[model samples]
Target: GAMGPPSSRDAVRVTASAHMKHWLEPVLCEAGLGHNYKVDKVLKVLRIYPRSNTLSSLPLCLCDANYKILAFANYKAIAAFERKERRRVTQNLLNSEIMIHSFTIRFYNDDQVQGFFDGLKFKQKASLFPGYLVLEINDFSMFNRDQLILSNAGTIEFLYGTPRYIARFIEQEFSDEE
Candidate 1:
């Protein structure tokens, strides 16, 4: 299921809890500050569709305050961080076909993204998805804070804006100089 394009407002207005604020601080100080996120409130939770319990949003792959890229917003996304362990999957969750939730990691235009997956000793699936190399990972240990740690598959970290968006933001910021 999908909705209209993420509006410009949606870009700045994030949706998440404050639990991971410490992890988000670096990006917030840089990408947020005065850019997209708000001091008042951020809309991080999407109402559950289909049938529902209290499960709100998938803590993984959440949109940052800058609307640049979806950052890992929850400690629950990783078992190492979760006190309950694999809480994303449970008897209640398995019944509904989900609980913790799975997410799409859009390896935007990185040819190496596939190579990274290809090099993994563990069995992984990295395939063409919506013109992007989408890897939907269910395991929590694969994520460490703001990084996707894939053991031999290599790691990918996003420290600032989405590489593409920040590049453009920089371009426009210095457009008059050039």
Candidate 2:
């Protein structure tokens, strides 16, 4: 029943090029970090608004012309006297006090090389400080060739950002981690 070819299913091996054909193919395979490129870390920004309690808290809608009038009336009002106004103004002020957010990584004890986190922390601290490439884990070199390594023990709190960002952040985060 299995008569396709001599090395059909037997040669179904996975290589870096097999799946690294995306935005980070160059980073994971070709370029080894000496090349300068547009590097951005910030993924996105989040903001939260204070809860309004003056009116029937039904979410603000600027569709009403009067809504716009009240939204910007505080600038003209030296003498303000309304709870709704204070609520709106308070929301605006509270919005300014935003809490920046980003992703964080965690490591497990029962992982490859016994102390995978420690090895990474050690390698990352000494060399490759400024540049973010070629990490050595227990005598093994990464990003040196089209050879990609993955561990079942390591994981992120949430899969965030692009492939290149994840690769860069993972290496960088190890240095920052204690």
Candidate 3:
């Protein structure tokens, strides 16, 4: 499906949650705080079509309170983080047509994220539901949520913000472990 162009706003504002506030403390405490992000740059580079469950205004990268690039355009950081936090797949999960689950992780340190991943792995591996686990990484709050879906040729067909789900028969039909 397609989507219309994004609407413009007079003044853009971003709210910092508990974890974001902690990460942006230094920038927030600076003498002169300004919009460090280049609105034009992001608008030009980011895609806005095919919107789904998430909003188009949501950021795809991470930045400080002042919009400074912390890990915005760095794929190395993401790759390393993903490698360390990769969870194991289960037999039941591999058999499911589709399943969905969301989980949040603290961005304080790499070790903490790894710990969370380990715990999630344990739970997912023991679940009775059938799902092909696919982790969707959200840089803003580090929501490494599981987006289970069927795959072909071992290649994951990413939802790309387009949420598609099937009806469930009962609670245990496809229970989300997280």
Candidate 4:
């Protein structure tokens, strides 16, 4: 059988699982995270006023399916490493509906950093979206035992999509940097 092109009405519906919903519920409920940015609320609003979902806070252009991507960090992890800056970045991306590919961690001074970047560059040349990089400072003593920790610092950068869009986002974010 021949496959048909998707219809304009063929939109993907995405929702967080019970666990993820519970995890983010507290943050969303707080007034500090900004208004009209909660994922659950967004889902509900999308059901009522579909047009509002078109406006996004993140740099990438997200399809509806992007919302289904699970929250990667545990609440404690988010609290620990991503309390302020990373939280803002993540919230912005989520609110904007950016299609996050994969989240990876790169250790600083690990000797593998250069090699990893080289590999990513090669992948980029082949027209691949090698995903985003979240660089972590590796100091093993910091985390408690049994913790499968990756990065210490939450420096996230989107690797593909529109460079201009990403550049604009970066500029906006770092404009206040000293």
Tell me, by lDDT, which candidate is best: 1
lDDT, candidate 1, at 134: 26
| CA displacement after TM-score superposition, residue 166 of candidate 2 (Å) | 1.3
Q: Against the true structure, what is every candidate's RMSD?
A: 17.9, 24.0, 21.6, 19.2
Compared with the true structure, what per-residue lDDT tens digits does model 2 show for residues 1-178? 7675687667786554332112233433454433333321111011222243343121111111111100111222212312323443223422222111211222222223223222322122333322222111111001112322222113312122234534654564655555
For model 3, the run of ten residues with the poorest summed lDDT: 38-47
Q: Residue 29 lDDT in model 1?
A: 45
Per residue, candidate 4 scores C-alpha lDDT tens digits across 141-177 of 1111121211211332333343643343233354345
TM-score of each: 0.22, 0.15, 0.18, 0.19
Q: After aligning candidate 4 to the native by TM-score, how far in Å is the CA of 156 from where it should be?
A: 20
Cα lDDT tens digits for candidate 3, 63-155: 222222111212333343345444221222112211112212112223322342322221123324322212222321122233332222133
Error of 4 at 123 (Å): 8.1
Residue-level error in angstroms, candidate 4, position 31:
17
Where model 1 places Cα greater than 4 Å from the true spot, the runs are 1-60, 71-77, 82-86, 89-107, 110-164, 168-178
Which scores higher on TM-score, 1 or 2? 1
Model 4 poorest ten-residue lDDT run: 137-146
Clashing pairs in 3: 93-131
Ranking by TM-score: 1, 4, 3, 2
